[PDB]
């Protein structure tokens, strides 16, 4: 139903819109790293998230380092499983080249180009696909102008040769927080968005103002990762500040994916230990974070 109705997504005047020009907001879940918790990524769990939580997008977090794709490329087939499930379920899907410790996206740029060529060749005639080319650039030596923008100006043409206009999300500096610099020096492709990530454990007032600054320059923003915990993924759940951010995103038409769908014993995890990897969870099988996120998406 979702993808049949909204179909081809595009950016118009800095906003995500559907094929009839109407604003659309995606809300869903990110996997944790596919190398650690891939059992939670399957048609049945995604169907349960679609039907019971109301998700309309699923993000497949394919770490590059930390035992991910560069070390063992088999995780790309789990991305394909997720994409095909999203097509069968009629929801959107984010293919996330999940850099982190490999803090400059240029480190594995050759591999990224090949990976995105493959995925855009396979899936580029489906409207479901959203490409996320560099999760979280980070470090004071990784800047928008010098590192990230040129990286994107190499990867985007590869995708565009196969898929002229599905959405591409591009990470920003300082762990996808520095939308100010990106918005002052935007990419040329008209169907690009810039990533912005937040954690409710951080006091967020200035970060909201910076997202507004970016939006005021005509830049489109996708909140492709956020958590209810601290920046580490652990250390408490901060539902007051999470709700502030939820409301802000609704006011600004910002799409989002929550981190993350796993039973790991960390506060940002959505599931408890014993949660079935194929869905069907009871209340007791959702963590404090997962219960909150499910509520947000069902409310929407
Ligand atoms: C965006 O931020 C989230 C945190 O809010 C990041 O997710 C965290 O990434 C950590 C680093 O990969 C991860 O910890 C690792 O978990 C592995 C599997 O259990 C361990 O083997 C490893 O020792 C540990 O460092 C957190 O569990 C996770 O929440 C996300 O990557 C960022 F994009």
Swiss-Prot record:
GO cellular component terms, A-Z: extracellular region
Entry EC number(s): 3.2.1.4
Principal cellular location given in the protein's record: secreted
Catalytic residues as annotated in Swiss-Prot or TrEMBL: 136 (proton donor), 225 (nucleophile)
Catalysis performed (reactions): Endohydrolysis of (1->4)-beta-D-glucosidic linkages in cellulose, lichenin and cereal beta-D-glucans
Presence of keyword Membrane: no
Keyword annotations from UniProtKB, A to Z: Carbohydrate metabolism, Cellulose degradation, Glycosidase, Hydrolase, Polysaccharide degradation, Secreted, Signal
Compartments where found: Secreted
Superkingdom of origin: Bacteria
Sample GO molecular function, one term: carbohydrate binding
GO annotation terms (biological process): cellulose catabolic process
Leading EC class: hydrolase
Residues binding substrate: 32, 36-37, 63, 98, 199, 231-232, 259, 264-266
Subunit-level organization: Monomer.
UniProt record similarity statement: Belongs to the glycosyl hydrolase 5 (cellulase A) family.
The protein's name: Endoglucanase 5A
Taxonomic lineage: Bacteria, Bacillati, Bacillota, Bacilli, Bacillales
């Amino acid at each position: 139903s979702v993808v049949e109705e909204h179909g081809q997504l595009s950016i118009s005047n800095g906003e995500l819109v559907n094929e009839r020009g109407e604003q659309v907001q995606l809300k869903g879940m990110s996997s944790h790293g596919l190398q650690w918790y891939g059992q939670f990524v399957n048609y049945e769990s995604m169907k349960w998230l679609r039907d019971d939580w109301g998700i309309n997008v699923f993000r497949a977090a394919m770490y590059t380092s930390s035992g991910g794709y560069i070390d063992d490329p088999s995780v790309k087939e789990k991305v394909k499983e997720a994409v095909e499930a999203a097509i069968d379920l009629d929801i959107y899907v984010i293919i996330d080249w999940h850099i982190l410790s490999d803090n400059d996206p240029n480190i594995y740029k050759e591999e990224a180009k090949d990976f995105f060529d493959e995925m855009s060749e396979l899936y580029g005639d489906y409207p479901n696909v959203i490409y996320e080319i560099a999760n979280e650039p980070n470090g004071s030596d990784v800047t928008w102008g010098n590192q990230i923008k040129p990286y994107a100006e190499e990867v985007i043409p590869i995708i565009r040769n196969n898929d002229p206009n599905n959405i591409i999300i591009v990470g920003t500096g300082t762990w996808s927080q520095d939308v100010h610099h990106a918005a002052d020096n935007q990419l040329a492709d008209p169907n690009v968005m810039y990533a912005f990530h937040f954690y409710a454990g951080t006091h967020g007032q200035n970060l909201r103002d910076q997202v507004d600054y970016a939006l005021d320059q005509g830049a489109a923003i996708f909140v492709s990762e956020w958590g209810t915990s601290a920046a580490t993924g652990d250390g408490g759940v901060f539902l007051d500040e999470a709700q502030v951010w939820i409301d802000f995103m609704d006011e600004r038409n910002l799409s989002w994916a929550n981190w993350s769908l796993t039973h790991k014993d960390e506060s940002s995890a959505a599931l408890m230990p014993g949660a079935n990897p194929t869905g069907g969870w009871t209340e007791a099988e959702l963590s404090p974070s997962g219960t909150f996120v499910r509520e947000k998406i069902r409310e929407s």
